[PDB]
Structure 1
């Protein structure tokens, strides 16, 4: 098995358009995920709130849907609760709270797309391992 274009094609937005990531931005996304996110979201779970994970099916039921690149990027700019009712930037890392989350400081838009790509690609690779926790280790 290889890391094909078809593995690397993820929904760009919610209307239906897709983007195909390169292997270089997949691997930059995994590096930037590990650097900025994996302390809480190793393997696609969430250590500090295990009820919510990074499975695509959970990201799809979020409000607004986060199961596409534009939805994931917007979360990294202005994170909300799962229903979209409260902005949670004072307790979740984001670009608007990069003063209190200093690892968010120099992330560019290409960096957020790369992280968003890694979050969407990784379940297509790992299956239920992504977001499944220790049962699937």
Structure 2
């Protein structure tokens, strides 16, 4: 098995356009995700609210859809509750709240894209492990 261009091809938007990430992008994504996100989201779960995970199906049923690059980049700029009803930047790391979540300060657009790509690719690799929690360790 290998990390192929096909594995690294993920939905860019809701309209069926894809984008193919480079291996450097994938590595940057893992690094940045560990840097700014893994403290709560290690393995694709959510420690401070385990009801919500980072599985692609879950993101797809989110509002607005979060199972593509644009959705995840937007979430990292202006995170909402699962129904899209509330903006939660005040209690969730984002560029909008980089003042109170300082690790968000040196994150570039390029970075957000890499993180997004990591979140989308990783379940293609790990399957049910991603968002599975300890049952699948």
Long gaps (5+) in structure 1: none
Measure the CA separation in 2 of the matches of 1:39 and 1:120.
18
Pairwise CA distance, 1:8: 0.1
Residue by residue, what CA displacement relative to the aligned partner does 1:77-106 show, whole Å, maximum 9, x if unpaired?
000000000000000000000000000001
Where 2:19 maps in the other structure, the secondary structure is strand
Tell me the equivalent position of 1:31.
Answer: 31
Q: CA RMSD in A?
A: 0.2
Pairwise CA distance, 1:133: 0.1
Pairwise CA distance, 1:120: 0.1
Measure the CA separation in 2 of the matches of 1:130 and 1:111.
21
Where 2:70 maps in the other structure, the secondary structure is helix
Where 1:15 maps in the other structure, the secondary structure is coil
Measure the CA separation in 2 of the matches of 1:126 and 1:102.
30
- TM-score, length basis structure 1: 1.00
- Runs of at least 4 residues of structure 1 off by over 3 A? none
Aligned residue-pair number: 137
Measure the CA separation in 2 of the matches of 1:21 and 1:110.
12
Long gaps (5+) in structure 2: none
Pairwise CA distance, 1:73: 0.3
Where 1:10 maps in the other structure, the secondary structure is strand
